């Protein structure tokens, strides 16, 4: 969760709204296990 600690302060002239871009990754201690087949992508049949 992301909360306004103080505020988004801006002077005259600069735009009163901005955007934040999130960038997710993992670390050197990350590990995966027990390979399966993916589920959050499916396919309509009849390729070509």
């Amino acid at each position: 969760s992301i909360w306004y600690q103080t505020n988004y302060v801006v002077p005259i002239g600069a735009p009163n709204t901005a955007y934040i871009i999130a960038l997710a990754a993992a670390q050197k201690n990350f590990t995966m296990k027990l390979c399966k087949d993916t589920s959050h992508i499916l396919q309509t049949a009849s390729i070509q």
Binding site: A18, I21, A22, L23, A24, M32, K33
Partner: protein
């Protein structure tokens, strides 16, 4: 690091680029909420847009720490402070900061 699209609100074609950045306007200073998202990579949500969230679909069990990097895309004269909290399990949605 690849883009975790928190703002998964739009559905139409033109606004699929709106889905990669979430806004930060000026508020009334009462410690409001900006955004919230689950920390579950294999679950259907913001992480499906990440390589981690697509390779973890090819695996069934995962273990380890995660990184989330937020970059401010505003003016140089813009300034502010935000609180990015991680609420462990058991924790319901917090109603306040």
């Amino acid at each position: 690091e690849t883009i975790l699209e928190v703002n998964n609100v739009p559905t139409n074609a033109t606004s699929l680029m709106e889905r990669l950045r979430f806004p930060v306007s000026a508020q009334a200073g009462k410690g409001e909420l900006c955004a919230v998202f689950r920390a579950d990579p294999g679950r259907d949500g913001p992480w499906q847009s990440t390589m981690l969230g697509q390779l973890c679909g090819y695996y069934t069990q995962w273990s380890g720490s995660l990184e989330v990097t937020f970059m401010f895309t505003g003016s140089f004269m813009a300034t502010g402070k935000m609180l990015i909290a991680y609420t462990p399990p058991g924790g319901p949605l917090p109603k306040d900061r």
